[PDB]
Amino acid sequence: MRILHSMLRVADLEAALEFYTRALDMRLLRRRDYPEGRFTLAFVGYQDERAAAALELTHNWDRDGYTQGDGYGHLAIEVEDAAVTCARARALGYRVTREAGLMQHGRSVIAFLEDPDGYKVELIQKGT
Amino acid sequence: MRILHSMLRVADLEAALEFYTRALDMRLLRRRDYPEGRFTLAFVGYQDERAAAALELTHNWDRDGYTQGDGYGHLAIEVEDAAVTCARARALGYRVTREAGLMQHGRSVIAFLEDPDGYKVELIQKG
Ligand SMILES: [Cl-]
Ligand code: NI
Ligand SMILES: [Zn+2]
Ligand SMILES: [Zn+2]
């Protein structure tokens, strides 16, 4: 057994893809657009779906938006340097909700970004 | 770069761990109380955290529950036999829903498990 993917609903697939590919260096693994069902799916990530868990982005062509709650937490990504990823995210005009630094009572360098839909992305610096 | 985990907040950590380990055969990889923050973290999965992305469970001590939005979808898991995992989750009292005609899954009927907090788990038969 293995974890395949986490699925999130997005209001604007192109805006979501611009975030994951540019700010996070993910590549588009697979995309399927279904005119019959009026929805699109896009799997983004770092490794092939066969090798690792990916991020599934779902776009309902007729849904303008989604309501966020407090149940879903975040997607965490391992980065070489968290300050660098934050500065790159800011240069692209993406939201850094928590700048890189050691978290509360730990030696872990962490940072938080928000994707265009408001989903939290946790950056954890390699060495933690 | 790599995906480390997906995080879900749970109202009852023990109920949640009972579901992930018994219904889904996940291993409890790591678990830690954070008394200053008044929360506990649990990491469940099938492989070592250094080798694969896991599922992070957050239990806030002073909370009874969460308000689920409609954006969050599901967590998909690869299984050896979806019918067996389904029949096992049912025996334990967990809800199983099945969907036919999902154009993204061809001719496959896909089963979805419902966890104690109402989060959906997509079952994908290996192959
Ligand atoms: Cl749209
Ligand atoms: Ni996390
Ligand atoms: Zn899925
Ligand atoms: Zn699916």
XYZ file of C-alpha atoms and ligand atoms in Angstrom:
259
model
C 0.000 0.000 0.000
C 0.901 3.685 -0.504
C -0.506 7.241 -0.334
C -1.375 8.300 -3.942
C -2.500 11.923 -3.760
C -4.305 14.635 -1.838
C -7.188 16.310 -3.773
C -8.044 20.073 -3.503
C -10.770 22.023 -5.339
C -9.618 25.229 -7.086
C -11.686 28.210 -8.428
C -9.248 28.972 -11.252
C -7.080 26.080 -12.448
C -4.669 28.297 -14.434
C -4.028 30.534 -11.409
C -3.492 27.365 -9.240
C -1.085 25.821 -11.853
C 0.919 29.072 -12.129
C 1.472 28.891 -8.313
C 2.536 25.235 -8.059
C 4.808 25.257 -11.159
C 6.491 28.729 -10.688
C 6.555 29.366 -6.915
C 7.048 25.659 -6.015
C 8.890 24.173 -9.068
C 6.346 21.365 -9.365
C 5.764 20.007 -12.839
C 2.380 19.066 -14.361
C 2.295 15.262 -14.174
C -1.072 14.656 -15.885
C -4.050 16.788 -16.916
C -7.525 15.617 -18.019
C -10.352 17.985 -19.140
C -13.789 16.440 -19.518
C -16.291 18.527 -21.564
C -18.883 15.746 -20.779
C -18.544 16.303 -17.016
C -17.451 20.009 -17.177
C -14.484 19.561 -14.915
C -10.700 19.348 -15.179
C -8.133 17.509 -13.020
C -4.444 18.328 -12.860
C -1.868 16.274 -10.949
C 1.204 18.309 -9.907
C 4.317 17.150 -8.078
C 8.018 16.364 -8.227
C 8.210 12.700 -9.077
C 6.161 10.390 -11.356
C 2.750 9.314 -9.853
C 4.070 5.699 -9.844
C 6.987 6.769 -7.557
C 5.389 9.293 -5.137
C 2.280 11.021 -3.768
C 1.068 13.959 -5.874
C -1.261 16.929 -5.516
C -4.631 16.549 -7.369
C -6.230 19.900 -8.332
C -9.927 19.718 -9.337
C -11.585 22.438 -11.381
C -15.363 22.442 -11.791
C -15.894 24.731 -14.871
C -19.180 26.080 -13.464
C -18.060 26.570 -9.757
C -16.789 30.147 -9.240
C -15.480 29.397 -5.737
C -15.205 27.228 -2.606
C -15.645 27.852 1.118
C -12.574 27.176 3.268
C -12.999 25.677 6.724
C -10.599 24.885 9.561
C -10.492 21.072 9.233
C -8.071 20.721 6.323
C -4.594 21.766 7.360
C -1.844 22.072 4.750
C 0.452 20.404 2.251
C 4.047 20.277 3.457
C 6.975 20.446 1.045
C 10.656 19.762 1.683
C 12.781 22.802 0.417
C 16.638 23.250 0.268
C 16.347 26.863 1.618
C 13.025 28.220 2.999
C 14.020 31.969 3.014
C 14.944 31.664 -0.746
C 11.538 29.970 -1.615
C 9.714 32.777 0.347
C 11.659 35.591 -1.429
C 10.942 33.852 -4.805
C 7.204 33.525 -3.854
C 7.116 37.283 -2.923
C 8.851 38.255 -6.245
C 6.050 36.421 -8.101
C 3.572 38.293 -5.886
C 2.404 35.227 -3.933
C 1.390 35.360 -0.279
C 3.960 34.401 2.400
C 1.831 34.192 5.633
C 4.842 33.203 7.779
C 8.442 34.004 6.776
C 11.158 31.335 7.186
C 12.557 30.855 10.682
C 12.841 28.347 13.538
C 9.348 27.448 14.782
C 8.392 28.135 18.465
C 10.243 25.400 20.397
C 12.186 23.395 17.811
C 15.299 23.455 15.555
C 13.109 23.105 12.397
C 13.281 25.943 9.810
C 9.664 26.369 8.626
C 7.666 28.848 6.434
C 4.054 29.245 5.272
C 2.670 30.194 1.901
C -0.915 30.458 0.737
C -1.842 29.386 -2.779
C -4.298 31.565 -4.883
C -7.289 29.726 -3.336
C -6.131 30.338 0.242
C -4.749 26.759 0.803
C -1.774 26.631 3.235
C 1.575 25.345 2.000
C 4.105 24.434 4.701
C 7.782 24.669 3.734
C 10.178 22.598 5.776
C 13.897 23.141 5.239
C 15.962 20.002 4.391
C 17.792 19.086 7.610
C 14.530 18.616 9.577
C 12.113 19.079 -3.344
C 9.472 16.536 -2.274
C 5.950 16.376 -0.797
C 6.358 15.583 2.936
C 2.778 15.277 4.158
C -0.880 16.385 3.989
C -2.234 17.612 7.373
C -5.819 17.078 8.707
C -7.142 18.360 12.083
C -9.003 15.634 14.114
C -11.518 16.081 16.996
C -10.501 12.771 18.695
C -6.881 11.579 18.064
C -7.566 8.048 19.376
C -10.676 7.576 17.132
C -8.688 8.880 14.080
C -5.646 6.572 14.820
C -8.026 3.662 15.294
C -9.382 4.303 11.744
C -6.022 4.858 9.968
C -4.261 1.873 11.593
C -7.113 -0.708 11.691
C -9.253 0.170 8.633
C -6.330 1.327 6.477
C -3.414 -0.726 7.938
C -1.286 2.424 8.317
C 1.711 2.404 10.707
C 1.903 5.060 13.429
C 5.301 6.468 12.392
C 5.686 9.340 14.846
C 3.534 11.007 17.521
C 4.341 14.029 19.785
C 2.644 16.159 22.468
C 3.372 19.961 22.181
C 2.249 21.196 25.669
C 3.021 24.904 25.070
C 0.783 24.870 21.954
C -1.734 22.459 23.577
C -1.726 20.057 20.654
C -0.490 16.618 19.657
C 0.860 15.623 16.181
C 0.609 12.072 14.766
C 2.152 10.844 11.468
C 0.577 7.783 9.835
C 1.608 6.037 6.632
C 2.984 3.018 4.823
C 6.660 3.929 4.375
C 9.454 5.802 6.308
C 8.872 9.605 6.252
C 12.325 10.053 4.599
C 11.155 7.847 1.656
C 7.483 8.886 1.185
C 4.819 11.478 1.995
C 2.717 10.714 5.075
C -0.531 11.857 6.667
C -0.156 14.337 9.571
C -2.956 14.355 12.154
C -3.322 17.408 14.401
C -5.259 17.150 17.646
C -5.867 20.467 19.435
C -6.577 19.711 23.144
C -9.047 22.563 23.671
C -11.261 21.769 20.629
C -14.298 19.517 20.339
C -14.529 19.752 16.539
C -13.935 21.569 13.244
C -15.928 23.378 10.568
C -15.246 21.598 7.255
C -15.228 23.750 4.124
C -16.162 22.460 0.670
C -12.726 22.942 -0.957
C -10.884 19.947 0.553
C -11.347 16.814 -1.510
C -9.838 13.537 -0.304
C -6.697 11.439 0.261
C -6.248 8.589 -2.229
C -4.664 5.288 -1.245
C -3.439 2.365 -3.353
C -4.779 -0.967 -2.076
C -4.085 -4.616 -3.037
C -7.811 -5.503 -2.934
C -10.376 -2.653 -2.740
C -13.322 -5.117 -2.041
C -11.419 -6.571 0.973
C -10.496 -3.069 2.425
C -14.222 -2.020 1.915
C -15.657 -5.140 3.631
C -13.096 -4.627 6.465
C -14.000 -0.890 6.979
C -17.723 -1.877 7.067
C -17.123 -4.620 9.727
C -15.500 -1.871 11.946
C -18.521 0.443 11.497
C -17.059 2.953 9.020
C -19.116 4.306 6.134
C -18.215 3.227 2.614
C -19.729 5.085 -0.397
C -19.200 3.916 -3.985
C -19.294 5.993 -7.182
C -19.872 4.644 -10.684
C -19.237 6.601 -13.920
C -16.443 8.914 -12.642
C -15.049 9.765 -16.113
C -11.603 10.201 -14.503
C -11.694 6.492 -13.475
C -12.872 4.910 -16.804
C -15.128 1.887 -16.099
C -13.988 1.480 -12.442
C -16.458 1.851 -9.565
C -14.551 3.790 -6.886
C -15.036 3.303 -3.147
C -14.637 6.151 -0.648
C -14.078 5.521 3.068
C -15.274 8.067 5.594
C -12.959 8.715 8.574
C -14.232 9.629 12.171
C -13.973 13.354 11.317
C -15.830 12.940 8.008
C -12.726 13.163 5.753
C -12.980 11.066 2.572
C -10.433 8.387 1.664
C -10.350 7.344 -2.006
C -9.562 3.673 -2.590
C -7.637 2.906 -5.782
C -7.116 -0.783 -6.565
C -3.364 -1.499 -7.344
C -3.102 -2.143 -11.112
Cl -13.843 28.529 -12.942
Ni 2.746 19.831 8.823
Zn -8.379 11.451 -6.241
Zn -10.805 10.000 -8.012
